[PDB]
Design a protein around this ligand. Structure first.
Ligand code: HEM
Length: 399
């Protein structure tokens, strides 16, 4: 059994293993860091099955849950939020914060998302490129999703800049285990004081909604409000940052695609759909443990055995997406949906928000900076380490 996670074939490419497994052994065993053996499913068909089956569990306390790292094994001991719950506890807690993320709620947030993007672009323009390109990640990719989520949670405007750097420190590569931990409790501590304020003086934000609708009536404890809020902050922020930078690099890599977008910003949604398919920036989140014997393909996964469903592999499934390894915003989509945001009940709560932010960024960026270009040779782009999810650390640009 090969050790998993697999290493990306290269900077922007998924692991070379998926393609061969998909063709020769769709459902197979891999070995985790601690010697454990888990099942790895690679076909779109099987990934959807794993993501919806009632015979599979997301509870991390269950022996056999596929933890990918030592640190991950230690994080499993904390009190769970809906992300690690099975029905009916899952939807019961998830429905408490879901209203802000529905398609219509997100449609009403468009004017705000647009202004945030416009303001950040202007700030970046107000420092030019005086014999010095700017890092698109620090100046734009990072602030955009951070300010938005922080603002929705309830953080006052003047605190956004500092809190944005703190959250970034948690997931930063050059961060010690000490500074990452200090950043965590810093964010948690701030969220606690915020919940106290919103209990006294509630307002229009996710925390006030929790306090007024769930905390006060005794539905959940204050610590729970802190947990869910913290979950909403850390769950997909690092991912959004990478998706934005990955989108810019991809347009740099296919000038023909960029030309079409510049000529018609209306193509943004299609570009985003292909981007979330082609670059599956969150590839290790669909994991389960079998509650009972279940047959997947020709294999039979026994009770208490772990399963990892690769949505990244599923998104390159030749059986579903014709010419999967080709990035094409003009591609004709099949009836089966891409799995960039997961599938089933645990499908990303912020999928519509994530897409709205990306569409806003990509329908505005090149209208503001028509001549925007990566300042370093494409082969020199600083991608995240090959054994981690796909992303970009920094991205030098001139405009
Ligand atoms: C483009 C960026 C994003 C990508 C590609 C992404 C991807 C995913 C994926 C693959 C899952 C796993 C779902 C499953 O188990 O099937 C997920 C879950 C989740 N995401 Fe995102 N996500 C993104 C942004 C966000 C943002 C911005 C937030 C926060 C507002 C967020 C919050 C969550 C939460 C809380 C869950 C767990 C939902 C549940 O278990 O019911 N995600 N996301």
């Amino acid at each position: 059994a090969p050790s998993f996670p697999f290493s990306r074939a290269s900077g922007p490419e998924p692991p070379a293993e998926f393609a061969k497994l998909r063709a020769t052994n769709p459902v197979s065993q891999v070995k985790l860091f601690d010697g454990s053996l888990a099942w790895l499913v690679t076909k779109h068909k099987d990934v959807c099955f794993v993501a919806t089956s009632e015979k599979l569990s997301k509870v991390r306390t269950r022996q056999g849950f596929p933890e990918l790292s030592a640190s991950g094994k230690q994080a499993a001991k904390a009190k769970p939020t809906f992300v690690d719950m099975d029905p009916p506890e899952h939807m019961h807690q998830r429905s408490m914060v879901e209203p802000t993320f529905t398609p219509e709620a997100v449609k009403n947030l468009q004017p705000y998302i647009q202004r945030t993007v416009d303001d950040l672009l202007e700030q970046m323009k107000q420092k030019g490129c005086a014999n010095g390109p700017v890092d698109l990640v620090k100046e734009f990719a990072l602030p955009v999703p951070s300010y938005i989520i922080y603002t929705l949670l309830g953080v006052p405007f003047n605190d956004l800049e500092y809190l944005t750097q703190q959250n970034a420190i948690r997931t930063n590569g050059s961060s010690t285990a000490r500074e990452a931990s200090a950043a965590n409790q810093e964010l948690l501590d701030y969220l606690a004081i915020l919940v106290e304020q919103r209990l006294v003086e509630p307002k229009d934000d996710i925390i006030s909604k929790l306090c007024t609708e769930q905390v006060k009536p005794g539905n959940i404890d204050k610590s729970d409000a802190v947990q869910i809020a913290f979950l909403l902050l850390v769950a997909g922020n690092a991912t959004m940052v990478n998706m934005i930078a990955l989108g810019v690099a991809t347009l740099a890599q296919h000038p023909d695609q960029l030309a079409q977008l510049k000529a018609n910003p209306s193509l943004a949604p299609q570009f985003v759909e292909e981007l979330c398919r082609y670059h599956t920036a969150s590839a290790l989140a669909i994991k389960r443990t079998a509650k009972e014997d279940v047959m997947i393909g020709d294999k039979l996964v026994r009770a208490n055995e772990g399963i990892i469903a690769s949505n990244q592999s599923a998104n390159r499934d030749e059986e579903v997406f014709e010419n999967p390894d080709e990035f094409n915003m003009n591609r004709k989509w099949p009836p089966q949906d891409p799995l960039g945001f997961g599938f089933g009940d645990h499908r990303c709560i912020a999928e519509h928000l994530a897409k709205a932010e990306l569409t806003t960024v990509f329908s505005t960026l090149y209208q503001k900076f028509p001549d925007l270009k990566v300042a370093v040779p494409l082969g020199k782009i600083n991608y995240t380490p090959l054994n981690r999810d796909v992303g970009i650390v920094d991205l030098p640009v001139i405009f």
